[PDB]
Amino acid sequence: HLKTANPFGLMVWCIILGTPSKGFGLYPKNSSWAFGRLRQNFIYSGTQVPPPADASPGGNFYGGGNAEILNLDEIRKVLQLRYVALISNGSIAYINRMLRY
Amino acid sequence: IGLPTSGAFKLEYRVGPALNLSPQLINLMNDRAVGIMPTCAGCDVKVIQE
Amino acid sequence: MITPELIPSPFAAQGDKDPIPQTSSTGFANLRDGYTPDYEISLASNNPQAKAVERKIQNQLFFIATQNAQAWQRQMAPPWFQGMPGGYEQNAEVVRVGNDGIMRRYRSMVNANASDPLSSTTWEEQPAWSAMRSNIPMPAGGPGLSSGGEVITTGRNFNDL
Amino acid sequence: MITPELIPSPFAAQGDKDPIPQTSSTGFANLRDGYTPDYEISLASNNPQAKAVERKIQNQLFFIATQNAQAWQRQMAPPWFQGMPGGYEQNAEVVRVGNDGIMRRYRSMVNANASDPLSSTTWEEQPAWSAMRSNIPMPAGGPGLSSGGEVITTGRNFNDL
Amino acid sequence: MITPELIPSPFAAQGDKDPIPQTSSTGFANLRDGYTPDYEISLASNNPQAKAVERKIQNQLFFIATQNAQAWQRQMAPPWFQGMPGGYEQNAEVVRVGNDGIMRRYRSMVNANASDPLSSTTWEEQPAWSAMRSNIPMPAGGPGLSSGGEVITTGRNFNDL
Amino acid sequence: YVNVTVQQGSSSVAPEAIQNAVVNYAQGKVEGEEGLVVGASLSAFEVAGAIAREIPGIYIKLCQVACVAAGSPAPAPGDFTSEYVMSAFGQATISVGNVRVTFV
Amino acid sequence: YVNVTVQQGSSSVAPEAIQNAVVNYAQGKVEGEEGLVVGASLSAFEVAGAIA
């Protein structure tokens, strides 16, 4: 779990701990157009199918904010915290030490 | 922070200036339905706090 | 005041804009749902229902708002529209331009009336203040918009009346 | 002539919508700042403020635009928004729902008028020229709505008038 | 009768914004082409005019739409903009800042009305309905604003006539 | 057109999973259920059965079905019934966009 | 209580295997869909789904 970079493992752990996975940000990134040259662009009817694949191979609204985290490292932290919550008896020194860990 | 957070059976977290945790992260941890936070029944705990 | 500086022309109004359907069975950008949840799937999912954000729809969406805004800026009343769903409610006004070309503001004197305002008695023409001030045959203070001058200030010839 | 095509239903009418936060400490599509600069960094860099454009935020924006435009297109005028910041300034003719059921235009006369149109003296109606002219005993043109017809060069019948 | 939501502030009111031109040079936003199709092209593929969606342009577009809707909600009439290109057709109705900032309805009498309504004799200023009830030398039904009461069922005693 | 009023359970689900389940049942890709063959009646109870087929745990509150002509405006609310019977020379097609999921 | 109306389709006769399915689902036997619990809500669509 400490090295569940593989999102599939993060999801297996969402099932194991019982976390609702609606709010997670798995799948590869680079699919949001938004704004900026570092993100995706819109798409059109490139009927000729030119090699640049028009402006982008896609561009979507995936990654809706205010509830969903995108970086997988914080997903790992969240799942560890949920295991701590599952086995927690309410102790404060214990919870502080696991937050440290 | 004065620290006491006066009250009974209820407290809160405090985090964020250190780890650059995402606001999306904090909002997710602040949702009681998800139930990822270590909680005792009969304590309202809000994470929020930066 | 809040001044919505006049936009010279609507957005993308010489280029391309695919019309917005009311509903989309293929899960595209319709009006009943706006941007469907299918516009939230990761495109890297290899899910066929993952719809990338097209801009023909985006251009049409922006063009609708820009054109409505500039019509509001440049012609005041909303143009009357053929067969508005539900006709037009009581006291609702529109402007149906006539063969003259001048704007002809029309008020709905009949509830839920769908009659053509250009050829409607129900769609009453809203005349100008000059028309009202001339429709009063005995106006105080001559033809002035103000009613002032009710009492004459000094000794003045009745030839002015 | 600018006639932006009829808006039958606003974008994202019955779809999901996120009410835009007025002000956000962490930059989250707020009205005060708009799309804040943190909506532009690459998501792969894993920096904390790597936001993405929310589908429901976009839906709510287009819904607001299309809803206001359609209301203007249909009822000629914005409704009376109760809890209006700063009341209603002088010369403000809000369309008001009738207690009976007729839409009735009440104009605030005093600057920053803040009372309900139905229960305030400040709000004054702007009716149609028919009930308006009903206050004139002796309308120009007699039965005729227009100013004309009052003067007849020909010896018209004295009985019919 | 659809009631939009109270717009307290336009989107991106205090955010960075860029003016949208009418003519284009590269894969840049316009007002007649909008988002360009030809240079729409892959932005991360080392191509010459390869363009990215512009935060400033889209923020200002939302700002414009929300500003128009907000001003519509408050003042119900576009402010007459100083020397707006294209002119005004006659009978157009606007309201704009007056001599004191006190504003009233103005209706133009000439097409291509390039003169400011505060400085235009063609633009005629239209006050409220109390001004009609004053312009009639005697108000129907006495001080009573409504025409009802002009005819009296019981003989109106002359101790107060 | 199918209107569903699902209630989210413990495990997370997306409305598109429900839509895909309904579409797969309609096409008949599921075992046992024939689907919407020629002269197959459109029952909201069978559609709810397919949703429970593919997505256990989700608590379905209200399922309604409606049938309209091809290339016609979507039916207004109230036209939806608990079950629609069909003639012997008709076939109902349910796309992903005609399944409207409400998370109550 | 439950009343069901079926058609005995596919020419596969099964008269009284329906209430067994209903009670089996209600008792919590089925997988993934916990049956009638202290917080449940008896639903026609759920029981029809269990029969299916």
Coordinates of N, CA, C and O in Angstrom, one line a residue, chain G residues 2 6-7 9-10 21 28 34-35 37 40 47 50:
Chain G
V2 N -46.6 -9.1 -1.1 CA -46.2 -8.9 -2.5 C -47.2 -9.6 -3.3 O -47.5 -10.8 -3.1
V6 N -46.9 -12.2 -13.7 CA -45.9 -12.7 -14.6 C -46.5 -13.3 -15.8 O -47.8 -13.4 -15.9
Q7 N -45.7 -13.7 -16.8 CA -46.2 -14.2 -18.1 C -45.8 -15.6 -18.4 O -46.2 -16.1 -19.4
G9 N -42.8 -16.6 -19.6 CA -42.2 -16.5 -20.9 C -41.2 -17.6 -21.1 O -40.8 -18.3 -20.2
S10 N -40.8 -17.6 -22.4 CA -39.7 -18.6 -22.9 C -40.2 -20.0 -22.7 O -39.4 -21.0 -22.9
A21 N -37.8 -17.1 -4.1 CA -36.8 -16.1 -4.4 C -37.0 -14.8 -3.6 O -36.0 -14.2 -3.1
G28 N -31.6 -11.9 3.2 CA -30.3 -11.5 3.0 C -29.4 -12.5 2.4 O -28.1 -12.4 2.4
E34 N -28.1 -6.6 0.3 CA -28.7 -6.9 1.6 C -30.2 -6.7 1.6 O -30.7 -5.7 1.1
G35 N -30.9 -7.7 2.2 CA -32.3 -7.7 2.1 C -33.0 -6.8 3.1 O -32.6 -5.6 3.3
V37 N -33.5 -5.1 6.2 CA -32.8 -4.9 7.4 C -33.5 -3.9 8.3 O -34.6 -3.4 7.8
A40 N -34.1 -0.8 6.2 CA -34.4 -1.0 4.8 C -35.6 -0.2 4.4 O -36.1 0.6 5.2
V47 N -37.8 -5.9 -5.2 CA -38.2 -7.3 -5.1 C -38.4 -7.8 -6.6 O -38.1 -9.0 -6.8
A50 N -35.0 -8.9 -7.5 CA -34.6 -10.1 -6.9 C -35.2 -11.3 -7.7 O -34.6 -12.3 -7.9

